[PDB]
Write a protein that binds this DNA or RNA. Structure first.
Lengths: 55, 191, 120, 77, 144
RNA sequence: AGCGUGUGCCUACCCUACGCCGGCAGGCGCGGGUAACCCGUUGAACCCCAUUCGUGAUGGGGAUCGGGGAUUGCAAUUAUUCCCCAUGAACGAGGAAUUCCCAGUAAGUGCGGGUCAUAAGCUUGCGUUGAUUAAGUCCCUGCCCUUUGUACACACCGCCCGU
């Protein structure tokens, strides 16, 4: 029963159901407004998104 | 018709200041006479702009201490008004005159300064500025009423009432007069 | 000499009743657990666990069956059964007394050792 | 440094009632705090006695509040 | 009225415990182990006794009615969710316990856990915390 | 009152007015919003007024612990969380020492966002009430410039003499 017990674990909810869409890590995710990455990747690619640190 | 700025129900006129050194620092007469002890603000901005504040407003502002009472201006105002009620019904004297004569009688006129290194006990006698006289007088009245009204059945509207009249007659049964004359005794002990 | 009674009913009375009223005979969490759904999605292990419990040794000490399921609520039908449940390292072989009802297998297998401090 | 743990009576005995009725309308300031201090009774008991004296008409009201109330004697003239 | 009444009972001896008579009846009965502030108002609402009287002037028939409400609260229309001991593991009855059934039933439940050898019983036997909280930083008054 | 947020790609998990049932935690058919339109005029808290309490480890304080009921999830036991009744410990303004701040500031008080299936004693923002003291100093802890001294330069937390 390798096929039916290989990934029968439900990852429907929880932290590991989502991941970073830049580098695929599961720590420090930003889910607000659907960015779906960690803080470092947003800080590195924040200029081309259009977010400016005016304040 | 604004014939007289009646402080709720007390008249701000016919009040006598006995000391001439506190004449321009206590403003209750004919210019800084309000209906309430609560004004707007911009009074602690510059250096000497707090000398133009009404004395009952300064007492109300110094009434609130010890964490759980900061900002509650309405509650201190109604303590002040009730205390004025017991002061008027208790002696037969106008309550603004009792406030003026207590601050003059409870003002420490000579101070000792800590001088030297940290730990050594040396005091040098200096005299107290007239603004600082009023300032420590109000602070002493407030802390005397505060430590009188603590873990006691007697309310703060009565504990504040007994504290000024004991300072007004100089009976030295009040706590402000107690620290005033031990401070004068310490300043006199080493000059 | 004392006879055990649970919720006003007897042991054989508890055996010869069903889950539809046994949920109200249980507590709040156990009613929610049994009323959640069918024991099919992950509890086919539980299905074959009560099957292996329904396997009957003869009139002696019953044979021990061991499992990794710490989330098993003690049914009344499995009183007087011999079981060792996994705490992570070994199997604590425990006798099912007629008092187990309303609990888990994780209630009766300790994980941490009781600490005995020495010198700092 | 004497403790003197106060044990206030929950209701009036004989001497407290006429002591109150002869001395409390002869005082300048009357509040339940000073009545409880002078007559060694409870705070709510002093409030009930002062409400009775107010209903009798021998005490005039000055100001009422949820914290404390202010009472005074009648004019002797 | 405000004068002390005759045979004003000072110390009330109810259910072999000591009860002061100087306290309010909604609060003087709360000194009994097992009954608190919330359930005291319901008892003096089922019985026709006002909440404005002290405990020291009540007499035998009203305190006897209150003791009946103590011992048998179910048929005086007290709701079933208001009770402290519900759905018993021994017999399955709704009851209110007043310090004797309370103390001996808590003792019997603790020895039941210690006999059944659940980890709640082992933690009660060892003298630790059972509700699952951190012990590393607190509980410094455990042992010397 | 003011910052906000709201049906998401694999990705399913949104914010909610209104009606009934139930003490409550909660449950079902119903309508809006992909947003200055709907929650929403965001009937927030502290405050204000009126009773009860009366110096009593007390109606302060809610730790510990027993029983019961709902929600999330495949799964709660080492109690996820919430609700109900009991249980009512220490604590009487805190030693030596030490942190932050000077105007809508400290402080009191609550509301949003982040983590989030279930979710704030943390953090970032927001609003309400709203002060005492001071317009100075180099004494302490340090910083900038000039002059001088040095056996230091891995730089005084350095180097070095003797039993």
């Amino acid at each position: 029963g390798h096929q039916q017990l290989y990934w029968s674990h439900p990852r429907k909810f929880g932290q590991g159901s989502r991941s970073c869409r830049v580098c695929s890590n599961r720590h420090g995710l930003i889910r607000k407004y659907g960015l779906n990455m960690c803080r470092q990747c947003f800080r590195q690619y924040a200029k081309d998104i259009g977010f400016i640190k005016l304040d | 018709t604004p014939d007289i700025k009646l402080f709720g129900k007390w008249s701000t006129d016919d009040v006598q200041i006995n000391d001439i050194s506190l004449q321009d620092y206590i403003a209750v007469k004919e210019k800084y006479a309000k209906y309430l002890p609560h004004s707007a603000g911009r009074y602690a901005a510059k250096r000497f702009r707090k000398a133009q504040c009404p004395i009952v407003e300064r007492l109300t502002n110094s009434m609130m201490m010890h964490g759980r009472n900061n900002g509650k201006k309405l509650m201190t105002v109604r303590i002040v008004k009730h205390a004025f009620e017991i002061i008027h019904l208790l002696t037969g004297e106008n309550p603004l005159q009792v406030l003026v004569n207590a601050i003059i009688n409870s003002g420490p006129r000579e101070d000792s300064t800590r001088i030297g290194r940290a730990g050594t006990v040396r005091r040098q006698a200096v005299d107290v500025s007239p603004l600082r006289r009023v300032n420590q007088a109000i602070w002493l009245l407030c802390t005397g009423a505060r430590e009188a009204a603590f873990r006691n059945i007697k309310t703060i509207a009565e504990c504040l009432a007994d504290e000024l009249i004991n300072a007004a007659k100089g009976s030295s049964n009040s706590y402000a007069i107690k620290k005033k004359d031990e401070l004068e005794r310490v300043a006199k002990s080493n000059r | 000499f004392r006879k055990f009674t649970y919720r006003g009913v007897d042991l054989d009375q508890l055996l010869d009743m069903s889950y539809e009223q046994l949920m109200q005979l249980y507590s709040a969490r156990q009613r929610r657990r049994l009323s959640r759904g069918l024991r099919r999605k992950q509890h086919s292990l539980l299905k074959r666990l009560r099957k292996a419990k329904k396997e009957a040794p003869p009139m002696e000490k019953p044979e021990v069956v061991k499992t990794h399921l710490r989330d098993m609520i003690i049914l009344p039908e499995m009183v007087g059964s011999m079981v060792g449940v996994y705490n992570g390292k070994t199997f604590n072989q425990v006798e099912i007394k007629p008092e187990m009802i309303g609990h888990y297998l994780g209630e009766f297998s300790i994980t941490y050792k009781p600490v005995k401090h020495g010198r700092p | 440094k004497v403790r003197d743990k106060l044990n206030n009576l929950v209701l009036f005995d004989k001497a407290t009632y006429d002591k109150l009725c002869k001395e409390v309308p002869n005082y300048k300031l009357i509040t339940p705090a000073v009545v409880s201090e002078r007559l060694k009774i409870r705070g709510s008991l002093a409030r009930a006695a002062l409400q009775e004296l107010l209903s009798k008409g021998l005490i005039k009201l000055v100001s009422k509040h949820r914290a404390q109330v202010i009472y005074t004697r009648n004019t002797k003239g | 009225s405000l004068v002390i009444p005759e045979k004003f009972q000072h110390i009330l001896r109810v259910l072999n415990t000591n009860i002061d008579g100087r306290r309010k009846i909604a609060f003087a009965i709360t000194a009994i182990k097992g009954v608190g502030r919330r359930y005291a108002h319901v008892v003096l609402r089922k019985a026709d006794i006002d909440l404005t009287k002290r405990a020291g002037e009540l007499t035998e028939d009203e305190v006897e009615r209150v003791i009946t409400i103590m011992q048998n609260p179910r048929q005086y229309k007290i709701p079933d969710w208001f009770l402290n001991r519900q759905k018993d593991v021994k017999d399955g009855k709704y009851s209110q316990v007043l310090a004797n059934g309370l103390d001996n039933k808590l003792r019997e439940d603790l020895e039941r856990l210690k006999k059944i050898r659940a980890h709640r019983g082992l933690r009660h036997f060892w003298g630790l915390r059972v509700r699952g909280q951190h012990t590393k930083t607190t509980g410094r008054r455990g042992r010397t």
